[PDB]
C-alpha cells in the first residue's frame, strides 16, 4: 500500500546521517516517484527529523541563531525563540525562518539567570555550537530545559558530525533533580563508510540558593559531565584496537607473525591433544 510505502519512506528519511537530509530526500523522492504522496505523507517525518537534529536556524535581522526543538514547537509549523520571546513560521523542507511575531511569567528570572551563564559555557567550550534555555511549568513545578547543539559538515573533506545535549532541572526547594542526555553522531565517507553513534544518560541532584548561584551549580555539573563524557570517548578510541576491536578480530596472531601457509597442518596439533 502507498501508506506502507510512505511509512517505509519515513523509516529511511528519519535515519538520515546529520547534514545529509537533502541527499537522502532527493533519492527517497525519486525512488517513491510521487511528489504529491511525499508532500502529503512525509511532512510529519521532516518535522520529526528537524526536532531530532535540534536544527539551528538564522532568524533574519537577529543577533544569534535559534534551535528547533519540541520544547519550542507551537504547532502550525511555528516555533519559539525564548531568548527574544518571539515565534516564527519554520520551513521544515528549506530550513527558513519567517513571520517573527511577539510571543510573550515567573520563569523569566530563571530564563535569564541561566541563559547568560549557558552562553558563557558555550563561549568557553564550543567552537561553533549554539544553546537555548527553554522553560515550562509541569504540574505546578518550575522546569528549566537547557539545550546545546554543535555540528561541523564538510562535504569536500568527506565527513559530517554532530554533538547534541539536553538538560532538565526542576525546582524542588531547597533542592532539584538534574537529568542530562548526551548524544553524538558522526560519519566519514572517503572510499568507505565509518559511523559513530553514541548516547549517554547523566543524572544527579543539586542544593538550591538564589537563582544566580544555583545556575553556577548547574553549569559546573554540566561542564564536569560533558568533560568526562568526551574524555571517556577519547580514552575509548585509544583503547578499542587492543580490547573491543581486538575481540571481533585480532590485528595479528598469538604468534605475533603472519601465518606460514606452508606449515598449515601443524596448527591442528595443540587441539588434537585437547581430544587426546
Amino acid at each position: 500500500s502507498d501508506e506502507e510505502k510512505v511509512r517505509i519512506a519515513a523509516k529511511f528519511i528519519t535515519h538520515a546521517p546529520p547534514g545529509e537530509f537533502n541527499e537522502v530526500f532527493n533519492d527517497v523522492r525519486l525512488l517513491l516517484n510521487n511528489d504529491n504522496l511525499l508532500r502529503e505523507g512525509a511532512a510529519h517525518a521532516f518535522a520529526q527529523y528537524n526536532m531530532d537534529q535540534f536544527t539551528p536556524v538564522k532568524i533574519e535581522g537577529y543577533d544569534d541563531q535559534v534551535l528547533i526543538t519540541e520544547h519550542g514547537d507551537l504547532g502550525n509549523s511555528r516555533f519559539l525563540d525564548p531568548r527574544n520571546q518571539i515565534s516564527f513560521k519554520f520551513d521544515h523542507l528549506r530550513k527558513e525562518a519567517s513571520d517573527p511575531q511577539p510571543e510573550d511569567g515567573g520563569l523569566k528570572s530563571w530564563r535569564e539567570s541561566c541563559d547568560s551563564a549557558l552562553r558563557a559555557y558555550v563561549k568557553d567550550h564550543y567552537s561553533n555550537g549554539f544553546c537555548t534555555v527553554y522553560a515550562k511549568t509541569i504540574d505546578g513545578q518550575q522546569t528549566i530545559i537547557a539545550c546545546i547543539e554543535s555540528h561541523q559538515f564538510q562535504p569536500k573533506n568527506f565527513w559530517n558530525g554532530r554533538w547534541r545535549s539536553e538538560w532538565k532541572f526542576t525546582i524542588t526547594p531547597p533542592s532539584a533533580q538534574v537529568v542530562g542526555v548526551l548524544k553524538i553522531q558522526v560519519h566519514y565517507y572517503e572510499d568507505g563508510n565509518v559511523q559513530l553513534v553514541s548516547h549517554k544518560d547523566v543524572q544527579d541532584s543539586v542544593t538550591v540558593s538564589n537563582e544566580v548561584q544555583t545556575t553556577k551549580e548547574f553549569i559546573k555539573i554540566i561542564e564536569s559531565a560533558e568533560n568526562e563524557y568526551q574524555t571517556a570517548i577519547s580514552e575509548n578510541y585509544q583503547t578499542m584496537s587492543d580490547t573491543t576491536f581486538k575481540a571481533l578480530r585480532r590485528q595479528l596472531p598469538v604468534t605475533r607473525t603472519k601465518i606460514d601457509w606452508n606449515k598449515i597442518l601443524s596448527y591442528k596439533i595443540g587441539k588434537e591433544m585437547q581430544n587426546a
Binding site: 517505509i8 523509516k11 529511511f12 535515519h15 538520515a16 546521517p17 537522502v24 533519492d27 525519486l30 525512488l31 517513491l32 516517484n33 567550550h125 564550543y126 567552537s127 555550537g129 554543535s150 561541523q152 565527513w159 558530525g161 554533538w163 558522526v186 566519514y188 568507505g192 563508510n193 565509518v194 559511523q195 559513530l196 553513534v197 553514541s198 548516547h199 549517554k200 560533558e226 568533560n227 563524557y229 568526551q230 574524555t231 571517556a232 570517548i233 577519547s234 575509548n236 578510541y237 578499542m240 584496537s241 573491543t244 576491536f245 575481540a247 571481533l248 578480530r249 585480532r250 590485528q251 595479528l252 598469538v254 603472519k258 601465518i259 601457509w261 606452508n262 598449515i264 596448527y267 591442528k268
Partner: protein
C-alpha cells in the same frame, strides 16, 4: 530513469546505519519491486549461517554455491534442500576446494578465535575463480556485541607456461561494534569498506594455489583492518575532539611571529 532510480538507491546504502542493512535493503526492495535481482547481486549483505546435519559443521550462504533455491554445503558437496541435479565442480576442483577449506578454517582459528567460514569454487575458461566467506559474532558478553563479515572474490589466470599465474582479489568487509560502560555511555560504532589488489606470484610445489591465496587474503585483511582502525582512531576520533576544547586556548602572537621570521629567513636560505 531506471539507472537514475538504480544509482539513487545505491546512494541510500552509503547513508544509513550499517547495523540494519539486511533490514533497510529488504525495505528498499519492499518499496520498489523493479530492482529485486540487481541490489541482491550488486551491493553487499551480511551473511547467514545455516546448519549442516550430516557432518555437523556450520557454513555460510551466498550466490556462488546457489542453484535455484538451495545451497551447496562445502563440507559434503550436497545441496540442502536435497536436489538430484545441481551444479558440481570437477574432481580436479573438489581436491582443491577441501584444501582451501582446510586453510581458511585455520586462518579463521588463528585470527578470529571462533566464528564460521566457507570457501566455494567455480570454473572459468582459462582458470578458476573462487570466494572466501567469513563471519564472526559476539561471544555473549556485552562489550563484544557486534559482528564481522568478510567476503572475498578471487580469480586466477593460469598461464599455460605452468610457472606464474595472475591473481586478482576484490575484497569487502562489513563491521559493527557496540561498547557499553558507565563513563562512556553507549557507543554504537560500525561501518563498511571495500578494496582490491593484484599480484603475479609464481606457482610450484613449494608454493601451491592454496598457499598463494593464503598470503593474498591475510595481507589484504591486515591492510583493511589496520586502516579501518585508523578511521576510528582516524577521523571519528578527532572530529568528536574538534567540537570543543576542555581548555581556553590563548592568543599566539610570538609563536606566529617566530613562524613569520622562519618564513622570511627561508625565502633567502632555500
Amino acid at each position: 530513469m531506471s539507472d537514475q532510480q538504480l544509482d539513487c538507491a545505491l546512494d541510500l546504502m552509503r547513508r544509513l546505519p550499517p547495523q540494519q542493512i539486511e533490514k533497510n535493503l529488504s525495505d528498499l526492495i519492499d518499496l520498489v519491486p523493479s530492482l529485486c535481482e540487481d541490489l541482491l547481486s550488486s551491493v553487499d549483505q551480511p551473511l547467514k549461517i545455516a546448519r549442516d546435519k550430516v557432518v555437523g559443521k556450520d557454513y555460510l550462504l551466498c550466490d556462488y554455491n546457489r542453484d535455484g533455491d538451495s545451497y551447496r554445503s562445502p563440507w559434503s558437496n550436497k545441496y540442502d534442500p536435497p536436489l538430484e541435479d545441481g551444479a558440481m565442480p570437477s574432481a580436479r576442483l573438489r581436491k582443491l576446494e577441501v584444501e582451501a577449506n582446510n586453510a581458511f578454517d585455520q586462518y579463521r582459528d588463528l585470527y578470529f578465535e571462533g566464528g564460521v567460514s566457507s570457501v566455494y569454487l567455480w570454473d572459468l575458461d582459462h582458470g578458476f575463480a573462487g570466494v572466501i566467506l567469513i563471519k564472526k559474532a559476539g561471544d555473549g558478553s556485552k562489550k563484544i556485541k557486534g559482528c564481522w563479515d568478510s567476503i572475498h572474490v578471487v580469480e586466477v589466470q593460469e598461464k599455460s607456461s605452468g610457472r606464474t599465474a595472475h591473481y586478482k582479489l576484490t575484497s569487502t568487509v562489513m563491521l559493527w561494534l557496540q561498547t557499553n560502560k558507565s563513563g562512556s555511555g553507549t557507543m554504537n560504532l560500525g561501518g563498511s569498506l571495500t578494496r582490491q589488489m593484484e599480484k603475479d606470484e609464481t606457482v610450484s610445489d613449494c608454493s601451491p594455489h592454496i598457499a598463494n591465496i593464503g598470503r593474498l587474503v591475510e595481507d589484504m585483511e591486515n591492510k583493511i583492518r589496520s586502516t579501518l582502525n585508523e578511521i576510528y582512531f582516524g577521523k571519528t576520533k578527532d572530529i568528536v575532539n574538534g567540537l570543543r576544547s576542555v581548555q581556553t586556548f590563548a592568543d599566539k602572537s610570538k609563536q606566529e611571529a617566530l613562524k613569520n621570521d622562519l618564513v622570511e629567513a627561508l625565502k633567502r636560505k632555500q
